[PDB]
Nucleic acid binder design. Structure first.
Ligand SMILES: [Mg+2]
Ligand SMILES: [Mg+2]
Ligand SMILES: [Mg+2]
Ligand SMILES: [Mg+2]
Ligand SMILES: [Mg+2]
Ligand SMILES: [Mg+2]
Ligand SMILES: [Mg+2]
Ligand SMILES: [Mg+2]
Ligand SMILES: [Mg+2]
Ligand SMILES: [Mg+2]
Ligand SMILES: [Mg+2]
Ligand SMILES: [Mg+2]
Ligand SMILES: [Mg+2]
Ligand SMILES: [Mg+2]
Ligand SMILES: [Mg+2]
Ligand SMILES: [Mg+2]
Ligand SMILES: [Mg+2]
Ligand SMILES: [Mg+2]
Ligand SMILES: [Mg+2]
Ligand SMILES: [Mg+2]
Ligand SMILES: [Mg+2]
Ligand SMILES: [Mg+2]
Ligand SMILES: [Mg+2]
Ligand SMILES: [Mg+2]
Ligand SMILES: [Mg+2]
Ligand SMILES: [Mg+2]
Ligand SMILES: [Mg+2]
Ligand SMILES: [Mg+2]
Ligand SMILES: [Mg+2]
Ligand SMILES: [Mg+2]
Ligand SMILES: [Mg+2]
Ligand SMILES: [Mg+2]
Ligand SMILES: [Mg+2]
Ligand SMILES: [Mg+2]
Ligand SMILES: [Mg+2]
Ligand SMILES: [Mg+2]
Ligand SMILES: [Mg+2]
Ligand SMILES: [Mg+2]
Ligand SMILES: [Mg+2]
Ligand SMILES: [Mg+2]
Ligand SMILES: [Mg+2]
Ligand SMILES: [Mg+2]
Ligand SMILES: [Mg+2]
Ligand SMILES: [Mg+2]
Ligand SMILES: [Mg+2]
Ligand SMILES: [Mg+2]
Ligand SMILES: [Mg+2]
Ligand SMILES: [Mg+2]
Ligand SMILES: [Mg+2]
Ligand SMILES: [Mg+2]
Ligand SMILES: [Mg+2]
Ligand SMILES: [Mg+2]
Lengths: 211, 296, 121, 169, 58, 159
RNA sequence: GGUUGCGGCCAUAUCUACCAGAAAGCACCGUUUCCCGUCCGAUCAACUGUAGUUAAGCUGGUAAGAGCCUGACCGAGUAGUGUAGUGGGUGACCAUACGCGAAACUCAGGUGCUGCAAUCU
RNA sequence: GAGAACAGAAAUCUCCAGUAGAACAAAAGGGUAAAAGCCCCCUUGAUUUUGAUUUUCAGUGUGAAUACAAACCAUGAAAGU
RNA sequence: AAGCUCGUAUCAGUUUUAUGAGGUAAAGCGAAUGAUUAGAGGUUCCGGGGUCGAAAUGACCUUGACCUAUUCUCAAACUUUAAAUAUGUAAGAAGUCCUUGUUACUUAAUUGAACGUGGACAUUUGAAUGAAGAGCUUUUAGUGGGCCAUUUUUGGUAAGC
């Protein structure tokens, strides 16, 4: 009864979110978006590989969930549940309607039927962060997930430290200086702005010349 | 302040600060808008306001107009001018409030031409009356009472001011029911009383009434009235003759002065603190990352 | 300039040489005289109407035109829009309605206007 | 420094929370009347509870705000009942303090079985001079921190004059 | 029998056939809607100067 | 069915400007309009009495009347293939004097000047506005400036 | 230059924390006979200017402060967009041509200007 | 938020913070902070006359509305409304 | 269709300059509202469970909530910002100044407002381009099923819908 996804591939209509106006919509099939060792520190996982959209299209909550299960399964089986952090970078917020079918085309406003995430070209879909010594296995992970999606998607070796915002060496320069300090699984960076006082409170490690 | 209180970015960032003169708790714009706006078909006709304001005991009377560049003082009389006319004491009181107003009426009605025509009531028996138009003559100078934030109470002295400008010769449209000695329970004004207040009957009568119930206080205050041997009775003529004197020469004298403007400007930057240079500031910060960081 | 901008996909234009303004005026030069579109062909036809402004010959005309003189509005309007034929040996492009830059014929093709205008004149 | 950033008492506001209107509440007004000297004020229920047995606008309680020397007396004479031992709470972080005492007879006041017995909240609000700034009509401003009434400031104010205790931790 | 509901198609075509007629300006417009207190007096004022400019030609 | 009330569609249009709610500042009332004055029309939502209709938002007209708290502005509205005349009764809060004409008005005063400045001199004026002319010949130096050569750049990613 | 009364623009004025403020002025402050208002002379009303104080108000200054204001080829000629083609591509979409062109961002600078009147070491 | 007998998640009392996160019959959207919200006080302009205007438009009507003129009143110390 | 009054006059499905209006596209969400993934540090005399317990407004763990500074992601009916296209007005003789009449309106006021009288400055008289001219009046036909393309776009899986 789930209509073939072919029916909703393109972004033909304009964002129909769940809202006071909507309300009666079904739940998302994709519901966990951070699998693997997500607790891990930024320093632990330098390599970041991406699944990247080559199309302006729509991905279902279902094909997200399916593809989610697929990679995470591969990645843990071949490198363990703690070898990687899988983040789904895309949330299915767009409600899809259907004209269930007395009468025919008279007043044919659809009922919610399913959700899609609307995705750009170049838009990242999955991100994974590991240790470089896991590349091929991570890559294969995403490769197998690709099969679970319509559209063309590219997989890109990133230039960045993990899910961090700086390329590896830039992160390095900062980190091997004062600057970087640890958070949940991210990092707080030293600002040259704001109170001098509770700036040295945080980051005691900065405020030193050499080593 | 307390931790849990403390204003975030968003609070402050979205904040619509009021008019300064409102944050200052000084100017009430709702009344202002309605005090000042003129009939659009009365073109550049200014709408003149009679500002009355009481300091902690100095009474201010100005006649103002408005200019998008900033209001314009026609003329100003302060009750601290009253020693000139023979009033050295009690310069916050109803009868001082009267005199000062009277002064401001005479002063401007002078500088306008209708000095001679429009004398108002020379008598002053506390009768209720605004100044009438001369049959074939210049209509009187018309002014509207800018009370400010004064609470309109019946007996209030903001209106003592009013009644002096009106007794002066100014047209200052007004009713009785806020003058001392208006009857709550009959639409009726005892003028035997409001006369008193104009001449300061309540103060004087307080004096005689303390002359022999308690002299500890009557010297604790009315200290002045003693030190200058002015026991009650005289007080009505004190003011009566100030009246006389005020009408006889409203012309305003400025302070003699001593020390030029230039000079006050000197011995004041003495006590004014200098804003700092951003070069200087970074030499405070770097200074501080030398101290608080480098392990003292 | 903003006018031209608006009509690029429908015209061809460029900077014209003295050579081609001369052979424009000499060969297909006509005046608007009580409307009527009278051929130039004698100098008195010009002095007659453009004489008000200096300008009393076919070469005075040309001159006021190429130097964009102080009286160019009058001078240029005096000339009826030139009516030339199709480029003789073709447009050089296979498809006309593209920019010059994109291998087609419309747009500002600059000093290359002359090579054309001749073929069509 | 310290000149007259003293510590006077702003006002004493005792309040009787009756659960209802009528005879019980009027007798409880009568209590506060002949205790304050000032004719007291009634308060209506703000909403409706049905388990507290009250309707909106019900006239549900009485209270009175007593200032000046008069306050000193009653504060004192309840501080009697409380044997001059409060608690670390009772004292707001903003600097006032309040205490509870049931049986109003236990401070002057005879009995009379036609006026019965009532309990009473005592609440002393503190300030320094120049409080008027945050209170008058014009130029309504705010007390600078170095003048705001702390809690600690008041507890020692309270401890010292009165020779009472604070107890607890 | 449903049929076409509404279109603006081809309407500017038609407006432009014969105009969009620039609004037409007059020196001395009307006093229509002008405040009557004004107009009452303004009448007497003109009457006045008219009379004067008559007495000018004596 | 459809809805087409007096102020319909005017959500953001009569809205109030970010951090500019509150009283209208007192100059809006000190300004002085006369007949023949050109004014720009923009509704102030906080002021409900005497609002223009939405159509006349961002419209410019001429004062034809002056009353106690209002000016009458005449606008040319065009309907069909023609303009008709509309007198709008507006409150002084929805009107401002228009700058649409000061450049002209400035230019006239200016033109009268350099015309008498020129007359009293030896004529020789030229004072119509001419549009942006093409720029002249010019020479660009290399003293301090040799052309840096750029090429196009290969494909990259950073992600 | 300070201050006050009335202002214009309405944060470069607001927010948080400290610190300094001569002189005048404002202020807090004293009193309850009178007009006046309160549950309460706290507000509001009167009266003194006397008995007191810079504590607060107020003004200013500090802060790799929050905010706000300004600038810049910082990002970015990016996104978006008007125009063109018998351009590419199954499509989704995408390039190219003549034009217009942001927002975030990043960095720097700044933190009330000023009108009328009176007053002041 | 922190405080006060019975008193509890919620009763009434106080102080701090509070850009409006409330409230303004009603749908929603605009709007409003010494107010447009809450409390109080005084009231009948929710009145009289007959035109102009804006929206819808044919530039008809109807409904609703806007600014005046000419009365008579309300309220306010007043400007005003 | 008939014309009529005029004629370089005045005219414009265009640009330019000056000055307004707008909340779409984009963008934003460690900015309001509303959604949404993840941890990290907080806070309870105060949601619940557990060890100690005579209790504790007791200590300790515990998961929830709330707070703080962070993090992935969204909006036709959200938004601080904010385009491109499109859109109001102005670019002079019906102009800009000066001199001082009229009134019952209006001003404290021959103050102002409006309408004038008398006087000073001509086509580089005030951007561009064009103009087989401009304005005006009367009357009457047919029509009041429309359909298509590119772009914007709503419903529909879709349609030669
Ligand atoms: Mg599309
Ligand atoms: Mg659709
Ligand atoms: Mg059927
Ligand atoms: Mg069906
Ligand atoms: Mg339905
Ligand atoms: Mg695929
Ligand atoms: Mg980021
Ligand atoms: Mg907070
Ligand atoms: Mg921040
Ligand atoms: Mg008022
Ligand atoms: Mg050839
Ligand atoms: Mg050949
Ligand atoms: Mg051939
Ligand atoms: Mg071909
Ligand atoms: Mg040939
Ligand atoms: Mg001291
Ligand atoms: Mg009970
Ligand atoms: Mg049918
Ligand atoms: Mg059909
Ligand atoms: Mg039809
Ligand atoms: Mg609708
Ligand atoms: Mg209809
Ligand atoms: Mg506000
Ligand atoms: Mg109304
Ligand atoms: Mg001093
Ligand atoms: Mg009494
Ligand atoms: Mg007192
Ligand atoms: Mg008082
Ligand atoms: Mg100090
Ligand atoms: Mg002050
Ligand atoms: Mg800062
Ligand atoms: Mg485009
Ligand atoms: Mg194409
Ligand atoms: Mg692109
Ligand atoms: Mg509403
Ligand atoms: Mg107010
Ligand atoms: Mg009715
Ligand atoms: Mg009809
Ligand atoms: Mg009708
Ligand atoms: Mg819209
Ligand atoms: Mg968008
Ligand atoms: Mg943005
Ligand atoms: Mg987007
Ligand atoms: Mg958000
Ligand atoms: Mg939108
Ligand atoms: Mg245009
Ligand atoms: Mg021509
Ligand atoms: Mg012709
Ligand atoms: Mg016909
Ligand atoms: Mg028909
Ligand atoms: Mg038919
Ligand atoms: Mg076509």
């Amino acid at each position: 009864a789930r209509r073939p996804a072919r029916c909703y591939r393109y972004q033909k209509n304009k964002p129909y979110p769940k809202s006071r106006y909507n309300r009666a919509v079904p739940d998302s099939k994709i519901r966990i978006y951070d699998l693997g060792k997500k607790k891990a520190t930024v320093d632990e996982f330098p390599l970041c590989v991406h699944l990247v959209s080559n199309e302006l299209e729509q991905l279902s909550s279902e094909a997200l969930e399916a593809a989610r299960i697929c990679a995470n399964k591969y990645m843990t089986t071949v490198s363990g549940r703690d070898a990687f952090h899988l983040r789904v970078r895309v949330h299915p917020f767009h409600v899809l309607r259907i004209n269930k079918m007395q009468q025919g085309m008279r007043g044919a406003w659809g009922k919610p039927h399913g959700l899609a995430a609307r995705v750009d070209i170049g838009q990242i879909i999955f991100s994974v962060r590991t240790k470089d010594s896991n590349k091929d296995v991570v890559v294969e992970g995403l490769r197998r997930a690709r099969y679970k999606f319509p559209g063309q998607q590219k997989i890109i070796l990133s230039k960045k430290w993990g899910f961090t915002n700086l390329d590896r060496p830039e992160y390095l320069k900062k980190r091997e200086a004062g600057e970087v300090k640890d958070d949940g699984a991210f990092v707080k960076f030293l600002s040259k702005k704001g109170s001098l006082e509770n700036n040295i409170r945080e980051f005691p490690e900065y405020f030193a010349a050499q080593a | 302040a307390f931790q849990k209180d403390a204003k975030s970015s968003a609070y402050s960032s979205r904040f619509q600060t009021p008019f300064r003169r409102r944050r200052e708790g000084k100017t009430d714009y709702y009344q202002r808008k309605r005090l000042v706006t003129q009939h659009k078909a009365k073109y550049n006709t200014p709408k003149y306001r009679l500002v009355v304001r009481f300091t902690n005991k100095d009474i201010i009377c100005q006649i103002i107009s408005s200019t998008i560049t900033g209001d314009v003082v026609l003329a100003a009389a302060y009750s601290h001018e009253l020693p000139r006319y023979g009033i050295t004491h009690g310069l916050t009181n109803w009868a001082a409030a009267y005199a000062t107003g009277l002064l401001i009426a005479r002063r401007t009605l002078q500088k306008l031409g209708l000095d001679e025509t429009y004398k108002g009531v020379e008598e002053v028996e506390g009768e209720y009356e605004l100044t009438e138009a001369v049959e074939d003559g210049p209509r009187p100078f018309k002014v509207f009472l800018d009370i400010g934030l004064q609470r309109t109470t019946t007996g209030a002295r903001v209106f003592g001011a009013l009644k002096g400008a009106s007794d002066g010769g100014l047209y200052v449209p007004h009713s009785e029911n806020r003058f001392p000695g208006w009857d709550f329970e009959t639409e009726e004004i005892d003028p035997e009383l409001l006369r008193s207040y104009i001449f300061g009957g309540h103060v004087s009568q307080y004096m005689e009434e303390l002359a022999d119930d308690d002299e500890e206080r009557f010297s604790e205050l009315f200290k002045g009235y003693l030190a200058d041997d002015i026991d009650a009775d005289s007080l009505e003529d004190i003011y009566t003759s100030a009246h006389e004197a005020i009408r006889a020469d409203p012309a305003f004298k400025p302070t003699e002065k001593k020390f030029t403007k230039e000079q006050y400007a000197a011995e004041s930057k003495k006590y004014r603190q200098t804003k700092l240079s951003k070069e200087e500031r970074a030499a405070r910060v770097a200074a501080k990352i030398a101290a608080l960081a480098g392990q003292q | 300039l903003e006018l031209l901008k608006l009509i690029e996909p429908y015209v061809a234009y460029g900077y014209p040489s003295y050579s081609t303004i001369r052979q424009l005026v000499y060969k297909r030069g006509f005046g608007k005289i009580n409307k009527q579109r009278v051929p130039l062909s004698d100098n008195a036809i010009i002095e007659a109407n453009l004489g008000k402004y200096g300008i009393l010959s076919i070469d005075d005309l040309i001159h006021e035109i190429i130097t964009v003189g102080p009286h160019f509005k009058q001078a240029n309007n005096f000339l009826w829009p030139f009516k030339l034929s199709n480029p003789s040996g073709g447009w050089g492009v296979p498809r006309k309605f593209k920019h010059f830059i994109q291998g087609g014929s419309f747009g500002n093709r600059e000093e290359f206007i002359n090579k054309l205008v001749k073929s069509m004149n | 420094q310290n000149p007259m950033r003293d510590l006077k008492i702003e006002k004493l506001v005792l309040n009787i929370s009756v659960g209802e209107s009528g005879d019980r509440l009027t007798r409880a007004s009568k209590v506060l009347e002949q205790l304050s000297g000032q004719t007291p004020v009634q308060s209506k229920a703000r909403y409706t509870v049905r388990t507290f047995g009250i309707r909106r606008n019900e006239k549900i309680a009485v209270h009175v705000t007593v200032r000046g020397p008069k306050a000193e007396e009653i504060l004192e004479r309840g501080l009697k009942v409380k044997e001059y031992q409060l608690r670390d709470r009772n004292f707001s972080a903003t600097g006032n303090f309040g205490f509870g005492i049931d049986e109003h007879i236990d401070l002057g006041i005879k009995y009379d079985p036609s006026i019965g017995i009532f309990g009473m909240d005592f609440y002393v609000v503190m300030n320094r001079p120049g409080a008027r700034v945050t209170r008058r009509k014009r130029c309504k401003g705010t007390v600078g921190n170095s003048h705001k009434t702390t809690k600690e400031d008041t507890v020692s104010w309270f401890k010292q004059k009165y020779d009472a205790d604070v107890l607890d931790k | 029998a449903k049929s076409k509901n509404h279109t603006a198609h081809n309407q500017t075509r038609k407006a432009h056939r014969n105009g969009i007629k620039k609004p037409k300006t007059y020196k001395y417009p009307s006093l229509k809607g002008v405040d009557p207190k004004f107009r009452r007096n303004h009448k007497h004022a003109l009457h006045g100067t008219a009379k004067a400019l008559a007495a000018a030609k004596k | 069915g459809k809805s087409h009330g007096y102020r319909s569609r005017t959500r953001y249009m009569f809205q109030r400007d970010f951090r500019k709610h509150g009283a209208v500042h007192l100059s809006t009332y000190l300004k002085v309009y006369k007949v023949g004055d050109i004014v720009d029309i923009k509704a102030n939502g906080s002021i409900q009495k005497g609002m223009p209709h939405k159509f006349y938002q961002g419209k410019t007209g001429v004062v034809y009347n002056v009353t106690k708290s209002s000016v009458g502005v005449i606008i040319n509205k065009m309907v069909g293939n023609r303009y008709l005349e509309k007198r709008l009764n507006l409150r002084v809060e929805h009107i401002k004097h228009s700058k649409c004409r000061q450049e002209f008005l400035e230019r006239v005063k200016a033109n009268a000047a350099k015309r008498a400045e020129a007359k009293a001199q030896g004529v020789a004026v030229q004072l119509k506005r001419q549009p942006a002319q093409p720029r002249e010949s010019r020479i660009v130096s290399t003293e301090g400036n040799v052309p840096q050569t750029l090429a196009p750049v290969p494909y990259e990613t950073f992600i």
